[model samples]
Target chain A: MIRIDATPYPYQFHPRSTALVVIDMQRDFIEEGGFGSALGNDVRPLAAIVPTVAALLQLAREAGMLVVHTRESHLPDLSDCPRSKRLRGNPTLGIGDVGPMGRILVQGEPGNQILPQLAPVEGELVIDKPGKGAFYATDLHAQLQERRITHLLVAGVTTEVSVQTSMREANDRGYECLVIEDACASYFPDFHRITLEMLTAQGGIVGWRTPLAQLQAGVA
Target chain B: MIRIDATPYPYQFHPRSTALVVIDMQRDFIEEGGFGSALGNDVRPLAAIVPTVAALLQLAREAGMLVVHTRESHLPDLSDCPRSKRLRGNPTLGIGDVGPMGRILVQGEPGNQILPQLAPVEGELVIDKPGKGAFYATDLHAQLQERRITHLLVAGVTTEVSVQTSMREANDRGYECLVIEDACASYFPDFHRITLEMLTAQGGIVGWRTPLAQLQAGV
Candidate 1:
């Protein structure tokens, strides 16, 4: 049996081997006029963590770690995510629509650009995944492999949904993962705690909990 | 947003509507003679809870609840389980071949029978599920729907695997669930506690973590 609690491979940052996956930090999830606001105060708490994440991004970039951003946007026509009952008739948020919140960061649109505060510097990579998981239906794994990256540090919004799914998928793919708990936010605090606890359990993920401070300290 | 802490509709016993979901209580997991034994005294801890589970079953039957037992049996060819690579390669513990402990509760085979102390008296139900969750590829959902059952009280071994999956599926299907935590066993206490915490947090199931004595006080 693989011992889960074994001390994580000493937190060494070999830029060529480590990657940081920032998930769904889009305006749709963080900005006031975005889909998240339309859904109530869901993403409000997440906005506070944005600056800290930006700081982490800067640290990772300086450390030469590959930075990848995941956006939950779809094509304008939303042909990628054909409407389902769950979508509740919102075509713009259907699947890949460059939603109303901001157009630049919209998939295929300039508004869909990575948030300015933490824009990927020239040489970094950007991956677009349609579903909750950063790896689902995307070349994220191949991209990481091609770059010879193994260790992953995750920072994102929606701790329970996107982040949780990505972490589980990463563990299954045998990548050592570290989820920055404080750097992540969610709509429900209970769900957030539960997701973190579940990910730490056996048969779930091979990861442990760490705050932003520990990550920074380890990297520094 | 649904309140996960809300109490489910009052517990009721609708024999036909309710089917007992017994999860992963096989020798390989809970008894002394299988892969569990090889894993360093993991199965011994389970003995403490088996009697408690038996008591729960007796109470269910007396209350006219449908009792269904689920076993994680593999096909003789072992083709269905591609994920259990660890269990598949063991020469003494390969699938289809009953563990050294013998066929669990075998219909006619003595060794395969339910533990003598916990055997269903008569007219109870038994289902053979191929995998973890009781509903996976089984007629369990249809059977329950036909019988008009809406509440499921889960009792079994291995809280992390079968119980967790079954509870999630049951919650998705809108069945109110009660997981008797004391009745479940696992090699790792952390796994058991974490499963309960996850289930309770997700609004997937109600956890009864107290002892029978305490449960009686509330019920």
Candidate 2:
């Protein structure tokens, strides 16, 4: 009857040795008229935590921790699309295609831009992932390894979908991951709770369920 | 990400066709003095759900579902022990043995009897399985197929370990499964919820999260 431990194994993380992985925080997921909006603005629940996340980012940056962002959008032509009919969805005209409303987090598109209040500063790492997890088909794992980051702090949208998958993959790859529960949002609170409970049971990730008040107290 | 569908697939249950899989409801998993208690009686949270589960067994029997009970006891001679030097902490021996605490519901033993209130009527099935899952190293799959039962309603203890693993194996074999949440219990409520959610996401099982009252009302 022993349950699996899903929390991240204990590890040391100094300011210079940690990486903050902010996943899928683009306008498509967080804005009003974006693709996620069409799906009922699923990311709106996360809006309240934006300032706290911003504070965490600032703190990490000042401590010299690496800050990385990931987006789940394809290119204008989807030149990055895998050569499989089953995997190919319409990038130009599909639900998550690159366009004014649903564009990927490219350099110039307004919808693709990270929120100005929490935008990445110069020299911060930015990653564009094509699938559910940042490590899938992306150099995220390699990049983190290259930086010698031993611990990862993950915060983002859609806890059940992208967040759960990425956390599982990270755990399998032996990365110490702490998921900031308050910093991530989901369309369905049930799904969010379920994902957190599952991850916690497996001992694969930690829930940084730090309250906004605690975070604010730590901030200026 | 593609979320797994939680809906039950189309499948008809033939009358007199279902094999009731009573998993790990034995002394080791259920009784206060069994091996499970020694491992950690933290499972009282799960044991608390036994009455509801016992009720489900009655309903399944009235509905003509087969009744099969599973246990994890080893023979006195220790024939079932995996011949490995690393096999530390033999549960059947020491303070965890099933017999001393009046917990081991051994066949023909008084405690081994099914919950009297929910005992299966005549001609129902009973299976004794050793591993974590009833399907593993047991004729459970063949027995169910022989009866032509395509739909399974699983009610048991330890959601993640025994029940969840069984549900996954059932799904892999293309059987439609419905896990009676109220009828099952686990040592940890968090583990219980997580297993249910994971199973739902994989389309392997559907949960009856409703209470017994709602379930009876067909709500």
Q: For each candidate, give the TM-score of chain B.
A: 0.77, 0.77
lDDT for each residue of candidate 2 in A1-220, tens digit (9 for 90 to 100): 1111223332234556678888877787777766555443345676776887787787768767789988776665655533321112222333334555545433346786777788888888988765556776678888888887766777887676667656645643556566766787776677777666655542222222333344334433
Write the residue-wise lDDT of candidate 2 on B1-219 in tens digits: 111122322223443655556676654566666555554445467567778878777666666667777654444444443232012223333321345554342334444444554555567666655445566556888888887776676778777666765665564455556676677777766677666665554222222233444334331
Q: Where does model 2 exceed 4 Å of error?
A: A1-12, A40-43, A79-93, A96-108, A201-209, A212-220, B1-219
lDDT of 1 by residue, B1-219 (tens): 111122222233344455566675655666666644543435777777887888877767766677777765544444444342233213344334465666432333333444655655567566666555576557887877877776677878777556766665565455656677788877677567765665554222222233344334332
C-alpha lDDT of candidate 2 relative to the true structure: 0.58
Docking class of 2: incorrect
Q: Candidate 1 falls in which docking quality class?
A: incorrect
lDDT of candidate 2 at residue B112, scale 0 to 100: 47
CA error at residue A45 for candidate 1, angstroms = 0.5
